[PDB]
């Protein structure tokens, strides 16, 4: 059965393309086939993003997947819950309740603010990026006047990449003038990146300072270039990497063709890329319901003009949404279960930790059981010399 | 001369689309006549905004007036600023050096920024809505670490309207 999928896919996204086409062999069956129209559009570009849209719309699509920004989160969303066509994607999760929006990223909010509570922190900076929304910003704060903190938020990502040298000089000596030793970056790796080069350039990667990288993509990171600095830098990976179902996954990744599969030839990947594979397990299981379930759905371009007024809905494209939303079933990323949003629940998030070793796992998050510590500290091994002034 | 205007106007905004018609009879010459193609519909919905957006841009208007949301500010921007055609808002200014969109409401931080100075303030609180954007909350934020101030900043928009006593 020709099944046909979305393809909105960013250019620059190919490793996640890669791994999506990695799925596309792998999650493939004699079954039904999914039928790809792949629109390698620019993310920013909404209208651009609507003709692309508007596109597989006029093919009569049945599952759309693909990314989308903070300039297209609302436009989305708009379509999505009016044309009632379902949409998956592995982006930054949304506020309201959506319907048709299928989000493979879990939040990163509740570990985060666990993880507060466990370094204890009050007094600290939180460096930030616009363009996965704000609502960790909002998260933070609320527990900010709750919990009694001194956040310093300070919103980095606008400025250009021409002199983003000078003026994070002049950001970290805004930051002596309360003395922080405790930054929170939120930020894209490669943003982040940039931001960890800036406290190289000026040595705050020392004893004394610490960090938490927050996203999904801290093994993402550049670690080694601040292993043995003296900062002690905390993060989440949302995958992780001892798995054997991750493992072979793994085995598998590294030996694909860089020229045929861009970004596949690596000894880890990223979390997009790897939600992005993970994605292709749910749709694959949702027709594989939609066929024992037996409901046919195998309609022509009834949907047609994106334009049509009053536009009318095709209920079989809502028993699509009811069926992901049963999807149970387990990933790279541990647990896939959903809410009535669609929205991720029972998942794990590994809170990981840089130490002389490198990156290691101190505990892991739940939903439920916040934050549950592992006893793996190998005595410690060491005791790191106690810094005794006088 | 019959010049078609646009008329992407809310519903309930009906004061704004008096003083609309007031200025429609007051600016009104024999040189040129505003044609209006008057659209009263949701301003939240963005897919019902496009709609009265293409419904006008199949008529070829020359200027487009109306409001926007938050929901709706990467919309129009993202639509004028492509198809090049002008766009007059009284609404929330944008962030962003947009092309083909005339904002007629002014900046409003710089006087704050003014005022908290002139207060002296350093410890206060900041209670806030989402639907005029965040850039004021990312203005006084700002502020907060470079004069040193204590800011409490709690959105309060997201509480409905059912118990909006007890929170």
Known sequence: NSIQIGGLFPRGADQEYSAFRVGMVQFSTSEFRLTPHIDNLEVANSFAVTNAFCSQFSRGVYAIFGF??????????????????????????????????????????????????????DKFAYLYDSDRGLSTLQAVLDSAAEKKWQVTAINVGNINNDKKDETYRSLFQDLELKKERRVILDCERDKVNDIVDQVITIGKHVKGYHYIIANLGFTDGDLLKIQFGGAEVSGFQIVDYDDSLVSKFIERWSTLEEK?????????????????????????????????????????????????????????????????????????????????????????????????????????????????????????????????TT
């Open 260 to 388: 045929e599969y861009p970004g596949a030839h690596t000894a880890t990947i990223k979390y997009t890329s790897a939600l992005t594979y993970d994605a292709v397990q749910v749709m694959t299981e949702a027709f594989r319901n939609l066929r024992k379930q037996r409901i046919e759905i195998s309609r022509r371009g009834n949907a047609g003009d994106c334009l049509a007024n009053p536009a009318v809905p095709w209920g079989q494209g809502v028993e699509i949404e009811r069926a992901l939303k049963q999807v149970q079933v387990e990933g790279l990323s541990g647990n896939i279960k959903f809410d009535q949003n669609g929205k991720r629940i029972n998942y794990t998030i590994n809170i990981m930790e840089l130490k002389t070793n490198g990156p290691r796992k101190i505990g892991y998050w739940s939903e439920v059981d916040k934050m549950v510590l592992t006893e793996d500290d190998t005595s410690g091994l060491e005791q790191k010399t106690v810094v005794v």
């Open 68 to 121: 989308y920004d903070k300039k297209s989160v609302n436009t989305i969303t708009s379509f999505c819950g009016t044309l009632h066509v379902s949409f998956i994607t592995p982006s930054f999760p949304t506020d309201g309740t959506h319907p048709f929006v299928i989000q493979m990223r879990p939040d990163l909010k509740g570990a985060l603010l666990s993880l507060i509570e466990y370094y204890q922190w």
